[PDB]
Design a protein around this motif. Structure first.
Motif, PDB file in Angstrom:
ATOM      1  N   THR A  84       1.161  -1.107   0.106  1.00 56.83           N
ATOM      2  CA  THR A  84      -0.114   0.144   0.229  1.00 56.83           C
ATOM      3  C   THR A  84       1.150   1.028  -0.362  1.00 56.83           C
ATOM      4  O   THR A  84       0.166   2.637   0.188  1.00 56.83           O
ATOM      5  CB  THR A  84      -1.597  -0.123   1.587  1.00 56.83           C
ATOM      6  N   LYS A  85       1.866   1.335   0.789  1.00 53.27           N
ATOM      7  CA  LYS A  85       2.477   2.246   0.253  1.00 53.27           C
ATOM      8  C   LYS A  85       3.625   2.257  -0.989  1.00 53.27           C
ATOM      9  O   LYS A  85       4.052   3.548  -0.934  1.00 53.27           O
ATOM     10  CB  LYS A  85       4.365   2.359   0.967  1.00 53.27           C
ATOM     11  N   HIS A  86       2.876   2.172  -2.591  1.00 48.78           N
ATOM     12  CA  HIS A  86       3.797   2.204  -3.136  1.00 48.78           C
ATOM     13  C   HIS A  86       2.992   1.260  -4.561  1.00 48.78           C
ATOM     14  O   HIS A  86       2.129   0.824  -4.311  1.00 48.78           O
ATOM     15  CB  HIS A  86       4.812   1.771  -3.640  1.00 48.78           C
ATOM     16  N   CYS A  87       2.977   1.687  -5.619  1.00 52.91           N
ATOM     17  CA  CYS A  87       2.454   1.164  -7.040  1.00 52.91           C
ATOM     18  C   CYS A  87       3.294   0.771  -8.262  1.00 52.91           C
ATOM     19  O   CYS A  87       3.340   1.184  -9.535  1.00 52.91           O
ATOM     20  CB  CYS A  87       1.346   2.665  -7.616  1.00 52.91           C
ATOM     21  N   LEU A  88       4.722   0.495  -8.132  1.00 57.54           N
ATOM     22  CA  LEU A  88       5.371  -0.221  -8.466  1.00 57.54           C
ATOM     23  C   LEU A  88       4.965  -1.864  -9.086  1.00 57.54           C
ATOM     24  O   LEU A  88       4.541  -2.252  -8.409  1.00 57.54           O
ATOM     25  CB  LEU A  88       6.533  -0.540  -7.547  1.00 57.54           C
ATOM     26  N   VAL A  89       5.177  -1.704 -10.545  1.00 55.06           N
ATOM     27  CA  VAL A  89       4.407  -2.785 -11.768  1.00 55.06           C
ATOM     28  C   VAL A  89       6.164  -3.301 -11.542  1.00 55.06           C
ATOM     29  O   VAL A  89       6.933  -2.458 -12.806  1.00 55.06           O
ATOM     30  CB  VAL A  89       3.871  -2.485 -12.949  1.00 55.06           C
ATOM     31  N   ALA A  90       5.929  -4.738 -11.888  1.00 59.00           N
ATOM     32  CA  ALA A  90       8.214  -4.822 -12.563  1.00 59.00           C
ATOM     33  C   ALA A  90       7.125  -5.673 -13.948  1.00 59.00           C
ATOM     34  O   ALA A  90       6.108  -6.974 -13.895  1.00 59.00           O
ATOM     35  CB  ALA A  90       8.106  -5.813 -11.202  1.00 59.00           C
ATOM     36  N   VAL A  91       8.067  -5.157 -14.663  1.00 63.56           N
ATOM     37  CA  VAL A  91       8.166  -6.026 -16.085  1.00 63.56           C
ATOM     38  C   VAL A  91       9.299  -6.747 -16.084  1.00 63.56           C
ATOM     39  O   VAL A  91      10.197  -6.001 -15.623  1.00 63.56           O
ATOM     40  CB  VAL A  91       8.159  -4.560 -17.245  1.00 63.56           C
ATOM     41  N   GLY A  92       8.723  -7.676 -16.852  1.00 62.32           N
ATOM     42  CA  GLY A  92      10.375  -8.851 -17.556  1.00 62.32           C
ATOM     43  C   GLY A  92      10.387  -8.718 -18.809  1.00 62.32           C
ATOM     44  O   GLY A  92       9.721  -8.595 -19.330  1.00 62.32           O
TER      45      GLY A  92
END
Ligand SMILES: [Zn+2]
Lengths: 51, 220, 377, 64, 50
Positions: free
Chosen positions: C154-162
């Motif tokens: 809930t502290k971030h909205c990082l999306v990890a893409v490979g």
DNA sequence: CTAGTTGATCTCATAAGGAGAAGGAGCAGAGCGCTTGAGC
């Protein structure tokens, strides 16, 4: 193996133009690209870039 | 079903005299799964029993899941009678007295071997001379078993052979009782009983039970 | 069944016992669309599926032709055998359509007003569910194989893409970022998946047979590079024996599940990284792309549904026994999703149909005319 | 001529193969990453480029 | 490098063919002080091994 | 043994061939362990 100066002599012009041999030019190219490869492989580089 | 028991049976099957008492008797992890139904635990028993120092599991190259098993004591007793009288006999003895009873990892890293075991960069060829250090990659190498070449050549030849006849069999089935009763083919010399265990573990066949014993079929 | 009911109202058994027991019974009784059907709009094979985190009602889908279709998964009709209609579809006529095959789609956790789809056209698109338009477009140098969003942070909205490149890309929905990048891999990253237990913990699986546990906050490399044989411990410590193309954390996040093209499946401790030595038998996997699988939640013993050729395999997560094979498809299946509330399964494959696997053993009582043998006498 | 093509769906270079079948006067082209197949009626004169042309034309026609 | 690598093993770096057999023994006996001939014979005999 | 000085030395800073030899392909047949397999 680096040849000595006798094998690749630095010719003297009628003035002062010290033209290097073609072997010397190829050696300089090899040294610069080898240093670039060394720094690239020591740092982070892409697989295709390294290839 | 005990892994201690499981490994023992396979050991008995091994054709010991066929290899002139030079290659220590290899048994595969594939045929380990045959005797013990729950593979999930078979690895777990052999894992602690690996660090217990009474087993050596060597990685082979006939497939990705190729993990062979060599008896520790027999692995010890046979390397000296093979290394001694040769130029490489020097530091292989050190490898034995230092590396084997202090580690059980399937492959040793460069910094690991050189530092932890205090190995130089010149004697390392001697271990490569006669089946002591294989070549995993530049940095790591799997543990080797000397004279493993002939075994796998016959092993792979045998696996193909048994697979072929099973397929050839009419209606593509062949009763297990019909392997033991029939004379073993001369193409495979490791033993017909040895290989049928291998496909069971490799799941190339399924032990289908019926009124007339148990049956093996190619996967559907 | 009745004993579970009586033991509940009496108080001998805690009320969770019947729910877990009846949940796991439904999973064992899974069978094809006894009361369902999925509307077919995907011309090509379907690559991904995702159920909304909240209320589990609308399901996204991404085809090999690039169209992405949002589905509806409850019987608004009185009669049974309802058809799962599509509320909306982003097709060719859309100005912002994925030109090429869309690989994976995902609902944003914590609300259903936004979802992200990543394709082989080297782009990750942020979408508005209500208006069915985009909000942020993230272009990439190489093709995109997977992308995951943290379901619990809930502290971030990082999306990890490979990507096909050898280095992980971390995009932040907040702001643009697109510059944070994780180094330590050597080949194409086929699967990324955040940890449901720890907000900043990320698992990345790539073609160099290595799975790495990262911490995004951490500024110094990886934390654990999972190895197979648990040696003493990189350019080593291979996670598998081929190409790791799968990743699925367990329900509580305490263990990791990975599938590779070595036809092997492994379960890994999340904290230290040692494999738990669960053998799982042979899990057929020849996919060169990201293989999507799921794990059951809220049952007596957790299950894992992994694609297996043209079938779906069900294994006990810890026991590692083969429960059953759900032979419904005709081409290879690449994505499966689990409906936690109702213990149902949805399977996307390459025969251009989403199949629903619903629990059986509940049939109408008569007062079957087709169920007879016609042998001559 | 060239035989390794780029798949119109998955965008992978040198990732398409052409199957030759003169006996059945037909040909098949399939990918390797996503494995997307197509069949066209071929002859003794057809070439692997021709089956691409038939496939890509059908794809555009199917896209119409 | 091509010839020597094809003659030797890719993994264990050993001669593909057992060197104590009569065929290799007679090949070596014929090729005494002829390294080129020895290489030619060894390569053309070990090329067939897979 | 200690400071101070003098050069070296480096680093970082802004802009209408051929003959032959070598490899590999593909088919073609011989041989043989095998697996039946059925006639006297
Ligand atoms: Zn493709």
């Amino acid at each position: 193996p680096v040849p000595p100066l006798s094998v690749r002599p630095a010719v003297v012009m009628q003035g002062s133009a010290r033209n290097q041999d073609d072997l010397t030019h190829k050696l300089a190219d090899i040294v610069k690209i080898n240093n670039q490869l060394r720094r690239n492989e020591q740092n982070g580089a892409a697989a295709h870039v390294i290839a | 079903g005990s892994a201690r028991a499981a490994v023992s049976e396979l050991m008995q099957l091994f054709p010991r005299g066929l290899f002139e008492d030079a290659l220590p008797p290899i048994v595969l992890r594939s045929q380990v799964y045959s005797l013990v139904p729950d593979r999930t635990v078979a690895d777990r028993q052999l894992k602690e029993l690996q660090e217990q120092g009474e087993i050596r599991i060597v990685q082979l190259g006939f497939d990705l899941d190729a993990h062979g098993i060599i008896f520790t004591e027999d692995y010890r007793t046979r390397v000296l009678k093979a290394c001694d009288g040769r130029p490489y006999a020097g530091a292989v003895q050190k490898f034995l007295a230092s590396v084997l009873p202090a580690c059980g990892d399937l492959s040793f890293q460069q910094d690991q071997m050189t530092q932890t075991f205090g190995f130089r960069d010149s004697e390392i060829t001697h271990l490569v001379n006669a089946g002591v250090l294989t070549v995993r990659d530049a940095g790591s190498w799997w543990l080797a078993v000397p004279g493993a070449g002939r075994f796998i050549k016959y092993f792979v030849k045998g696996r193909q052979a048994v697979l072929s006849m099973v397929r050839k069999a009419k209606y593509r089935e062949l009763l297990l009782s019909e392997l033991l009763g029939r004379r073993a083919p001369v193409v495979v010399r490791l033993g017909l009983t040895y290989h049928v265990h291998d496909l069971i573990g490799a799941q190339l066949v399924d032990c289908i039970s019926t009124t007339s014993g148990t049956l093996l079929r190619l996967p559907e | 069944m009745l004993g579970f009911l009586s033991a509940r109202q009496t108080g001998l058994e805690d009320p969770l016992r019947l729910r877990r027991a009846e949940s796991t019974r439904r999973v064992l009784g899974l069978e094809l669309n006894k009361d369902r059907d999925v509307e077919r709009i995907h011309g090509g094979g379907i690559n991904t599926l995702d159920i909304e985190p909240v209320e589990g009602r609308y399901m996204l889908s991404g085809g090999s032709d690039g169209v992405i279709v949002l589905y509806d998964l409850e019987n608004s009709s009185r009669q049974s055998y309802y058809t799962c209609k599509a509320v909306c579809s982003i097709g060719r006529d859309h100005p912002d359509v994925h030109r090429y095959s869309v690989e994976t789609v995902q609902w944003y956790p914590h609300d259903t007003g936004m979802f992200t789809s990543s394709s082989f056209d080297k782009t990750l698109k942020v979408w508005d569910t209500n208006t069915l338009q985009t909000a942020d477009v993230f272009n990439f140098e190489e093709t995109v194989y997977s992308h995951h969003m943290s379901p619990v942070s809930t502290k971030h909205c990082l999306v990890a893409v490979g990507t096909r490149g050898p280095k992980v890309q971390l995009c932040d929905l907040k702001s643009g970022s697109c510059s944070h990048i994780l180094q330590g891999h050597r080949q194409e990253i086929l699967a990324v998946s955040w940890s449901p237990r720890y907000d900043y913990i990320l698992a990345t699986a790539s073609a160099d047979s290595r799975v790495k546990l990262w911490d995004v906050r951490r500024a110094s490399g990886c934390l654990i590079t999972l190895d197979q044989h648990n040696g003493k411990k990189e350019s080593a410590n291979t996670a598998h024996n081929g190409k790791v193309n799968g990743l699925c954390f367990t329900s509580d996040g305490l263990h990791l599940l990975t599938v590779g093209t070595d036809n092997r499946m492994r379960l890994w401790n999340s904290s230290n990284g040692e494999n738990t030595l669960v053998n799982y038998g042979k899990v057929c996997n020849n996919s060169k792309k990201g293989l999507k699988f799921t794990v059951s939640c809220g049952c007596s013993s957790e299950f894992v549904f992994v694609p297996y050729g043209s079938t779906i395999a069900v294994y006990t997560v810890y026991s590692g026994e083969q429960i059953t094979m759900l032979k419904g498809h005709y081409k290879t299946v690449d994505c499966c999703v689990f409906q936690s509330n109702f213990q149902e399964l949805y399977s996307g494959s390459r025969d251009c149909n989403i199949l629903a696997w619903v629990p059986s053993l509940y049939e109408p009582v008569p007062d079957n005319p087709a169920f007879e043998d016609a042998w001559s006498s | 001529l060239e035989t390794q093509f780029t798949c119109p769906f998955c965008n992978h270079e040198k990732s398409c193969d052409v199957k030759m079948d003169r006996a059945r006067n037909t040909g098949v082209i399939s990918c390797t990453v996503c494995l997307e197949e197509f069949q066209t009626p071929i002859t003794y004169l057809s070439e692997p480029v021709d089956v691409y042309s038939d496939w890509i034309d059908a794809c555009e026609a199917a896209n119409q | 490098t091509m010839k020597v690598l094809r003659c030797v093993c890719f993994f264990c770096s050993k001669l593909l063919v057992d060197s104590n057999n009569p065929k290799i023994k007679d090949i070596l006996a014929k090729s005494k002080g002829q390294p080129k001939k020895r290489l030619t014979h060894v390569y053309d005999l070990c090329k067939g091994k897979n």
